[PDB]
Amino acid sequence: ILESPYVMMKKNHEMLEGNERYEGYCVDLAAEIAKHCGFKYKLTIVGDGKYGARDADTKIWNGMVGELVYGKADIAIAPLTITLVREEVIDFSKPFMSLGISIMIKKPQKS
Amino acid sequence: IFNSLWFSLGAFMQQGCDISPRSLSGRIVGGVWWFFTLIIISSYTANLAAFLTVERMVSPIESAEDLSKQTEIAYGTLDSGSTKEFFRRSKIAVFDKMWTYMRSAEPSVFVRTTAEGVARVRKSKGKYAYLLESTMNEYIEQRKPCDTMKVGGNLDSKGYGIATPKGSSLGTPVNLAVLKLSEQGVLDKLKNKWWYDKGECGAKDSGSKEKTSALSLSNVAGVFYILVGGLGLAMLVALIEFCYKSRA
Amino acid sequence: KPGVFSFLDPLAYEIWMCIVFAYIGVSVVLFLVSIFNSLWFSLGAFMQQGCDISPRSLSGRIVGGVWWFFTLIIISSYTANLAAFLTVERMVSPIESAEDLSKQTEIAYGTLDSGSTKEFFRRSKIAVFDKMWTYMRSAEPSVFVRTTAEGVARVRKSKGKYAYLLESTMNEYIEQRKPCDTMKVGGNLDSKGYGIATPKGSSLGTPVNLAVLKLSEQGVLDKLKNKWWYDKGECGAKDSGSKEKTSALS
Amino acid sequence: AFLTVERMVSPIESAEDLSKQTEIAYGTLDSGSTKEFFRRSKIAVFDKMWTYMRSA
Ligand SMILES: O=c1[nH]c2cc(C(F)(F)F)c(N3CCOCC3)cc2n(CP(=O)(O)O)c1=O
């Protein structure tokens, strides 16, 4: 997915083409994976922009999830939450970033 | 028209009145005045004590439980998404109370977009807390105007992980790469990078807001100004009095 | 802590500077109405209400009147503030970010003498943690301790002189323990996760995995964490927190 | 400080007050329908209380 900071366009992205157009945390991480497993690769953006969900009716996965199940995508590298329902349809790696629900509030500046 | 006015000025300055040869007349007024100013200054001091005390009683929230204990500050999540479903499915009494609350509270705490929620927080001036994914919260906190901040520990566990189609040969070696990058800690280097090195505010900036202290100069300094000003009036009156020493 | 410095707590030192200077400023003015006897007589003003040796007001008594209102407001504010200390009696934490421990030198800090953690600092490339490592290696007597129990000992003996790193859940688990003197501060330095382990190629693997995620989403894990920790806790945090309202006077 | 700390204290008027405190111990008969009522209880307050007595 196209999400900051994990994924960002170059301000002059038109000047670049291919993977260079994108930039971010996940991008560099992808470079890391490129080092450890040695591979050429192309970054690709999901169309709907959805993380992916199986509608109960058609029972068709959409989003990146569908892109994996339907062979559209070779590998997914994104802030993709692990879930049991997604666990059985695709194979996650071990988590690389613990995280959770959190409290955002105004900063208490004195006057 | 001035001399005993000056004497009353010699009364407020100290307790209240004297010189009067046993009662006489208005010395009893001196007593009543003493009683008077006594009462008022007492009440004043008590009042200021009330301000500082009530001020100290207040505490910043550091757990959602604090939200459960209050109502002055509205709180909620995105109108849709896994987050609300967490509370809805939650069986913990705190989270259950919170979910029942948000379901009951009107106007509804839910917002269409995360950005809209950020606006509802920033504009409520602390009267509306919001809840969202921790990493997202940290990523926003470094954003301008740096007016908002995350507080407390994470309510629950989740973890992003690399995804591959099942049975792919890449899977295991990639996961190995994950573990390697974790053990090396380079991932954290990246974390300090994009969340801070790219950040709009410093990591140590959060510590710039001090802590408790004890009485700033400000409030009393407001009295320092009227003090020095009173001295200036005293000087002006002094010199004009010398001018009457010349004129008269 | 007492030691005179405790006495000045209600009002800030800068304000003391300003009140002294304002006072001598009051003193020097008095001579003009009439300066060694001006400072003396001003001392005769502060000593009692304020001023006297002027014809009624003239342009002198007014100074002492404003002075009187002034000192009155000061003592009033003083009393209010001190009472405010005597009310809530909140207890500030010495530190926040782990970085602060690096920034200061007043309080020693260290870890278990052997284990993965020590390596984690020894192998850390982050400048903060590096500074922490060179620190912990440099200082003697060694911050390192042979056992976690030894860390408990040095901490309980520390009386705030020393701090000790360790596994988070273990730390909180100690926090539940008596005398509940212990408390954790700051977030985790680094992500980690205990997990179920199975022999390689075991058939049980995948079902175990699905079972783990299923139990996790049901909150059963968090529920049990609420159980074996806080519910079993020797010292309830808000329980012990609700109970602290004494008095008397040193 | 004396008068203030004095007024802050309040008499108990709900078991919830006990649930929120610990300084004053509380309990029931060692056996009987009441204890069963607490162990069978599903209300969060009573559940907290029974949980408290369970280990105290
Ligand atoms: O795998 C998932 N990973 C997700 C990662 C993120 C982000 F934090 F942005 F990385 C978010 N957002 C939260 C902040 O607002 C923008 C979207 C949603 C995700 N969802 C959908 P959910 O059901 O709403 O959690 C997933 O399913």
Curated annotation (Swiss-Prot), chain D:
This is Glutamate receptor 2. Homotetramer or heterotetramer of pore-forming glutamate receptor subunits. Tetramers may be formed by the dimerization of dimers. May interact with MPP4. Forms a ternary complex with GRIP1 and CSPG4. Interacts with ATAD1 in an ATP-dependent manner. ATAD1-catalyzed ATP hydrolysis disrupts binding to ATAD1 and to GRIP1 and leads to AMPAR complex disassembly. Interacts with GRIP2. Interacts with GRIP1. Interacts with NSF via its C-terminus. Interacts with CACNG2, PICK1 and GRIP2. Interacts with GRIA1 and SYNDIG1. Part of a complex containing GRIA2, NSF and NAPA and/or NAPB. The record marks 39 as: Interaction with the cone snail toxin Con-ikot-ikot. Palmitoylated. Depalmitoylated upon L-glutamate stimulation. L-glutamate binds at residues 33-34. It is found in: Cell membrane; Postsynaptic cell membrane; Postsynaptic density membrane. The M4 transmembrane segment mediates tetramerization and is required for cell surface expression. Ionotropic glutamate receptor that functions as a ligand-gated cation channel, gated by L-glutamate and glutamatergic agonists such as alpha-amino-3-hydroxy-5-methyl-4-isoxazolepropionic acid (AMPA), quisqualic acid, and kainic acid. L-glutamate acts as an excitatory neurotransmitter at many synapses in the central nervous system and plays an important role in fast excitatory synaptic transmission. The record marks 12 as: Crucial to convey clamshell closure to channel opening. Induction: Down-regulated in the pyramidal cell layer of CA1 in the hippocampus by global ischemia. The postsynaptic actions of L-glutamate are mediated by a variety of receptors that are named according to their selective agonists. This receptor binds AMPA (quisqualate) > L-glutamate > kainate. It comes from the Eukaryota. Detected in forebrain. Detected in dendrites of neuronal cells. Expressed in the pyramidal cell layers of CA1 and CA3 and in the granule cell layer of the dentate gyrus. The modification Phosphoserine is found at residue 41. Belongs to the glutamate-gated ion channel (TC 1.A.10.1) family. GRIA2 subfamily.
